Amino acid sequence: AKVLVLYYSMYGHIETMARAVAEGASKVDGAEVVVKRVPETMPPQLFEKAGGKTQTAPVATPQELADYDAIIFGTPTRFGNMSGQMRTFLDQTGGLWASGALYGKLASVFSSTGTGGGQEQTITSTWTTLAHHGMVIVPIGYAAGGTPYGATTIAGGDGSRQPSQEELSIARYQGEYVAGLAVKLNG
Amino acid sequence: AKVLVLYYSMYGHIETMARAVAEGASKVDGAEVVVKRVPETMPPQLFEKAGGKTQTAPVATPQELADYDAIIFGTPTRFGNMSGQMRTFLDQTGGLWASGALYGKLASVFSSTGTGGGQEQTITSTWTTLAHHGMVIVPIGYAAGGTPYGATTIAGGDGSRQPSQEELSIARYQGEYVAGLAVKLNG
Amino acid sequence: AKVLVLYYSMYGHIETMARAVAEGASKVDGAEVVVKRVPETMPPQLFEKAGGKTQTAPVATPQELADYDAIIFGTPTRFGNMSGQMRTFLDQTGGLWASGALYGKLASVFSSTGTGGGQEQTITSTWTTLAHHGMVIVPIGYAAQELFDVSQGTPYGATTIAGGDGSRQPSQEELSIARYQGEYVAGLAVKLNG
Amino acid sequence: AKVLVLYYSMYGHIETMARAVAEGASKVDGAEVVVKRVPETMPPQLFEKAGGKTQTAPVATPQELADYDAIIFGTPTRFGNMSGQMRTFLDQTGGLWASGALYGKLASVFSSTGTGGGQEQTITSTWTTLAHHGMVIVPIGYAAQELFDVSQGTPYGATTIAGGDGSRQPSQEELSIARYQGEYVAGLAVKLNG
Ligand SMILES: Cc1cc2nc3c(=O)[nH]c(=O)nc-3n(C[C@H](O)[C@H](O)[C@H](O)COP(=O)(O)O)c2cc1C
Numbered sequence: 001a002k003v004l005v006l007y008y009s010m011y012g013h014i015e016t017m018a019r020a021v022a023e024g025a026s027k028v029d030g031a032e033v034v035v036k037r038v039p040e041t042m043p044p045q046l047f048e049k050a051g052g053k054t055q056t057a058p059v060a061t062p063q064e065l066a067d068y069d070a071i072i073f074g075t076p077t078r079f080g081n082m083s084g085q086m087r088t089f090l091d092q093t094g095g096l097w098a099s100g101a102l103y104g105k106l107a108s109v110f111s112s113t114g115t116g117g118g119q120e121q122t123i124t125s126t127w128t129t130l131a132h133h134g135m136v137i138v139p140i141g142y143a144a145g146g147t148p149y150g151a152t153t154i155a156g157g158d159g160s161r162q163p164s165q166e167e168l169s170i171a172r173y174q175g176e177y178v179a180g181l182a183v184k185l186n187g
Numbered sequence: 188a189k190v191l192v193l194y195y196s197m198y199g200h201i202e203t204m205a206r207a208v209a210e211g212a213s214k215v216d217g218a219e220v221v222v223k224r225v226p227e228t229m230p231p232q233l234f235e236k237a238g239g240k241t242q243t244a245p246v247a248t249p250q251e252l253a254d255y256d257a258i259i260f261g262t263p264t265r266f267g268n269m270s271g272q273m274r275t276f277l278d279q280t281g282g283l284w285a286s287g288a289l290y291g292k293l294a295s296v297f298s299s300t301g302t303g304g305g306q307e308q309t310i311t312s313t314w315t316t317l318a319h320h321g322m323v324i325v326p327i328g329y330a331a332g333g334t335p336y337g338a339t340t341i342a343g344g345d346g347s348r349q350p351s352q353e354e355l356s357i358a359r360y361q362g363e364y365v366a367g368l369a370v371k372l373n374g
Numbered sequence: 375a376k377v378l379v380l381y382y383s384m385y386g387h388i389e390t391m392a393r394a395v396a397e398g399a400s401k402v403d404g405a406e407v408v409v410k411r412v413p414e415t416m417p418p419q420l421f422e423k424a425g426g427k428t429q430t431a432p433v434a435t436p437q438e439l440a441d442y443d444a445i446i447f448g449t450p451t452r453f454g455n456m457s458g459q460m461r462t463f464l465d466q467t468g469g470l471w472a473s474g475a476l477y478g479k480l481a482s483v484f485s486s487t488g489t490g491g492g493q494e495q496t497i498t499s500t501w502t503t504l505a506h507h508g509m510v511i512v513p514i515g516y517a518a519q520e521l522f523d524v525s526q527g528t529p530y531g532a533t534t535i536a537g538g539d540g541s542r543q544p545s546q547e548e549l550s551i552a553r554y555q556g557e558y559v560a561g562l563a564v565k566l567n568g
Numbered sequence: 569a570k571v572l573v574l575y576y577s578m579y580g581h582i583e584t585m586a587r588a589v590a591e592g593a594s595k596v597d598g599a600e601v602v603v604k605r606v607p608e609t610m611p612p613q614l615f616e617k618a619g620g621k622t623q624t625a626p627v628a629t630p631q632e633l634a635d636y637d638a639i640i641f642g643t644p645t646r647f648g649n650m651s652g653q654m655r656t657f658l659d660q661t662g663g664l665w666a667s668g669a670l671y672g673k674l675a676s677v678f679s680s681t682g683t684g685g686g687q688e689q690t691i692t693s694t695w696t697t698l699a700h701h702g703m704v705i706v707p708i709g710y711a712a713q714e715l716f717d718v719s720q721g722t723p724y725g726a727t728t729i730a731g732g733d734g735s736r737q738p739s740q741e742e743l744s745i746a747r748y749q750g751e752y753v754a755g756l757a758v759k760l761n762g
Pocket residue numbers: 008009010011012013014015075076077078079080112113114115116117118119155157658659660661662700
């Protein structure tokens with residue numbers, strides 16, 4: 001089964017989580033794992049002014065999402081929604097929608113946040129879009145700051161540092177668990 | 188694989204939908220289907236005053252939910268949430284939660300509504316509880332009044348009549364599709 | 375303006391928060407503040423065996439919600455929804471809905487959780503119902519620090535952590551935010567209604 | 569009171585609804601009403617090829633949102649969320665968030681959909697962001713029939729159906745509800761701010 005970890009990061013928190021998700025997924029024998037990012041939509045000079053961390057993962061196209069049995073989506077919490085970049089990207093998947101291309105495939109969501117709240121709403125509002133595509137939605141439940149909706153990191157914004165070891169463990173779990181389901185369903 | 192259709196109905200709309208869901212599930216060779224209701228919490232005299240339709244399906248206990256590979260939950264739209272009866276029932280599943288008993292099992296949701304709106308919020312707010320239990324959430328997507336979140340019936344409240352043939356077809360689809368996934372995952 | 379703080383509590387956490395909300399509301403001259411609870415639905419023997427806490431607040435009826443200008447709703451988080459007791463109570467507001475009785479009145483929500491997870495969904499899923507009644511929804515955002523009586527969460531409404539075992543009590547930081555919510559909502563109620 | 573109707577539209581459906589909202593708002597004496605759009609993010613050539621509609625409204629900046637008492641946000645439904653254009657615009661409100669600039673101001677939301685599905689989630693997921701800014705959320709409920717200029721949906725905000733092919737235009741029933749929303753929000757804005 002093929003697993004895509006697909007993410008948006010501006011300051012590297014989701015980037016770090018994505019690597020952990022992918023490590024977890026790669027523990028599953030039957031699973032082929034790939035990590036890609038959605039495009040940055042901000043002009044590089046605006047990204048740099050804002051202090052962004054340049055992302056180097058390969059860039060996904062909207063249409064290649066069809067190639068995978070499971071897609072694990074990472075986004076920062078942006079006032080309780082996914083980022084504009086992820087939203088712009090998903091707004092480009094209309095052509096898949098029309099064809100059923102993601103129907104029945106597994107979807108799961110991870111996030112990162114400051115200490116203001118909103119991470120639950122980010123994850124569940126991202127589910128909604130995934131449901132329009134007919135994707136099967138995988139929460140993490142009581143595996144575990146924490147939500148049962150998906151892994152999170154609390155990045156205590158500004159002088160910000162880094163995901164905790166416990167946070168990265170839960171992120172690894174989410175990838176291992178999603179990948180295991182993907183192999184059960186698809187070989 | 189074992190499939191439970193679990194529902195709450197006061198005026199029979201969800202009752203009618205549940206039968207359709209179960210017909211759909213029963214089309215799947217590997218699937219064993221059972222229909223049960225959550226208890227009515229209103230005193231019978233209060234139910235009758237309100238014009239309720241007496242429900243006769245067997246009553247589920249909260250703990251027997253553990254026996255099934257997939258659970259398809261039906262609730263009327265009540266101001267954009269599940270009914271108090273379904274909420275009281277799910278509030279009794281704490282003992283399962285604690286043990287992981289529903290973790291990884293499939294969950295899906297259907298609803299009924301008047302013409303006021305709220306059906307989307309009823310379905311997605313019910314998902315949230317299912318996620319706390321670690322259940323895998325199955326939307327219906329573009330199979331289809333309609334929502335991709337789950338089957339609905341628009342019961343145009345008062346002088347109310349009945350689910351449409353197209354509505355009942357989508358409800359059958361939801362059971363067939365959920366049951367098919369349950370057999371893929373569990374035999 | 376008349377402000378109702380309407381709550382459900384099994385183990386006292388929301389009760390403590392309700393009292394805080396009401397204290398904040400009472401700071402507003404011209405706000406008349408009342409605290410009531412929704413009925414317990416569990417048999418008393420079961421409530422007692424479970425260690426539920428007895429409470430002095432008067433029990434609300436659904437009808438009387440019409441008599442206020444603002445209603446601040448408190449509920450524990452039950453798997454990311456309001457409690458079955460609050461849901462069952464709100465399901466008895468159909469007659470009010472049909473007459474418009476709560477339309478345009480102010481509404482706000484507070485919660486409690488064991489370990490954090492779900493609190494945002496509890497608050498926003500309760501907003502849904504408030505919107506069907508046409509109530510004006512008041513989130514708390516991140517208010518100016520000087521408006522809190524303790525020097526310092528969610529923007530959706532005040533919350534408290536009860537711990538995994540239920541033994542934690544609300545901190546003065548948490549209670550300060552609850553007091554702020556009541557004062558802020560009551561302030562708006564008087565601005566709109568005298 | 570100053571009321572901003574701030575919208576995104578690709579094919580004109582939300583533009584038509586915005587104009588309706590503004591017409592309703594303008595009925596309130598003392599309400600100063602302004603309509604602006606968020607910037608298009610697609611390259612113009614791609615917008616044109618896709619059949620996007622050109623529009624006269626002035627383009628808003630994020631900063632100027634601070635200058636209003638009420639903001640009524642319009643967005644098409646994009647898989648049950650606001651559009652990437654509105655999301656990208658709101659993600660540029662961090663400086664306003666940090667200064668409190670929108671706190672306590674009134675907010676309300678309207679939408680459009682192709683075939684119905686998702687509209688409720690678009691509106692309530694936009695409320696989330698408004699709450700992070702501490703805005704007072706105004707749903708429309710089911711208002712008294714006599715307040716609509718056409719004799720007669722969701723309670724969360726006005727909506728319109730564009731059809732599967734995008735060719736449907738908003739009905740006078742739908743537009744009446746949009747006009748109501750603007751008049752009702754503007755009325756509240758003047759009650760609160762003069
Ligand atoms: C536009 C904007 C909105 C934000 N909204 C929230 C929020 O609602 N709650 C929160 O706690 N943090 C919020 N933050 C902080 C980010 O979620 C946080 O810094 C996250 O760790 C960044 O992930 P990244 O490094 O992958 O970009 C927001 C940041 C931005 C830029």
